[PDB]
């Protein structure tokens, strides 16, 4: 009876989203601006650094399923799923 | 190290999500 | 930064908990109903209600299984984790 690693993992996903989504514009979604920094600051060991706007256009395009030009939490969890799956195969 | 949109796009079709 | 981020160690933890339970019985890379039950009850005891009915675990595996082999591989497990986490988000801003 004390919160698991798994349960603290899920919470951390929520925290990192809000850490970056709260910055500009809609505080509950990630615009391309916020997505880039998140990836570059928090995924600098799993994903190649983004310095091209072309890259950020394409990542958001694949991530954005509701077509609002931003990444909400639901769309972000899919992203985490994609990245995590990839990391598993090389482990 | 390391992945890319190469590998990222590579696992967008193997599964969508039965959300 | 150069240190493993909280996000990146979270992802690792998802991987670790899966192998922690899938490696127990039978196929070490998949979760049989046996192994799924232990994972949920020991590691998700604050988000999901305890499972004590076999009927419950039967219905859940059916819903999780999209490739239709009756077991949960890592890919299917990430969908489950995604699903559970989203629900917890919704129940923090409502
Ligand atoms: Ca925002
Ligand atoms: Ca969106
Ligand atoms: Ca197993
Ligand atoms: Ca399956």
Distance separating alpha carbons of residues A73 and C57, to the nearest angstrom: 28
Question: CA dist C93 to A28, C56, C68, C76, C86, Å?
Answer: 10, 28, 35, 27, 11
Q: Which residues surround ligand 4, an ion (CB under 5 A)?
A: C 65, 67, 69, 76
Q: Which two tokens stand for residue A4?
A: 């698991």
Contacts of B17 in chain C (CB under 8 A): 79, 82-83
Q: Which one, of C44, C18, C42, C17, lies nearest residue C29 by Cα? A: C18
Q: Other C-beta atoms within 10 Å of B5: how many?
A: 15
Compare CB distances from A13 to C16, C18, C85 and report the shortest one's residue.
Answer: C85
Q: Which residues of C37-50 are buried (b: 16+ CB within 10 A; e: fewer)?
A: bebbeebbeebeee
CB within 8 Å: C82 and B17:
yes
SS3 content of chain C, % helix, strand, coil (to 5): 60, 0, 40
Q: C58 C-alpha vs ligand 4 centroid, how far in Å?
A: 13
Identify the closest residue of chain C to A41 by CA–CA distance.
Answer: C1
Q: Which one, of B14, C65, C66, C42, lies nearest residue A5 by Cα? A: C42
Distance separating alpha carbons of residues C65 and C40, to the nearest angstrom: 16
Compare CB distances from A86 to B1, B7, B17 and report the shortest one's residue.
Answer: B7
DSSP codes of every residue in chain B: --B-HHHHHTTTSS-----
Distance separating alpha carbons of residues C14 and B16, to the nearest angstrom: 19
CB A55 within 8 A of CB B11: no
C window 65-94, beta carbon within 8 A of B: 66, 75, 79, 82-83, 86
CB C82 within 8 A of CB A80: yes
- DSSP classification of residue A71: B
Q: Which residue segments constitute the domains of chain C, with CATH numbers given?
A: 1-94 (1.10.238.10)
User: Which technique was used to obtain these atomic coordinates?
Assistant: X-ray
Q: Which one, of C73, C32, C72, lies nearest residue C54 by Cα? A: C32
CB C82 within 8 A of CB C11: no
Q: C87 C-alpha vs ligand 2 centroid, how far in Å?
A: 17
């Amino acid at each position: 009876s004390h919160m698991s690693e798994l349960e603290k993992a899920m919470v951390a996903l929520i925290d990192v989203f809000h850490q970056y989504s709260g910055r500009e514009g809609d505080k509950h979604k990630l615009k391309k601006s916020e997505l880039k920094e998140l990836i570059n600051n928090e995924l600098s060991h799993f994903l190649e650094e983004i310095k091209e706007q072309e890259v950020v256009d394409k990542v958001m395009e694949t991530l954005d399923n509701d077509g609002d030009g931003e990444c909400d939490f639901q769309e972000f969890m899919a992203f985490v799923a994609m990245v995590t799956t990839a990391c598993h195969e090389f482990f | 190290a390391m992945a890319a949109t190469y590998s990222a796009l590579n696992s967008s079709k193997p599964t969508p999500q039965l959300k």
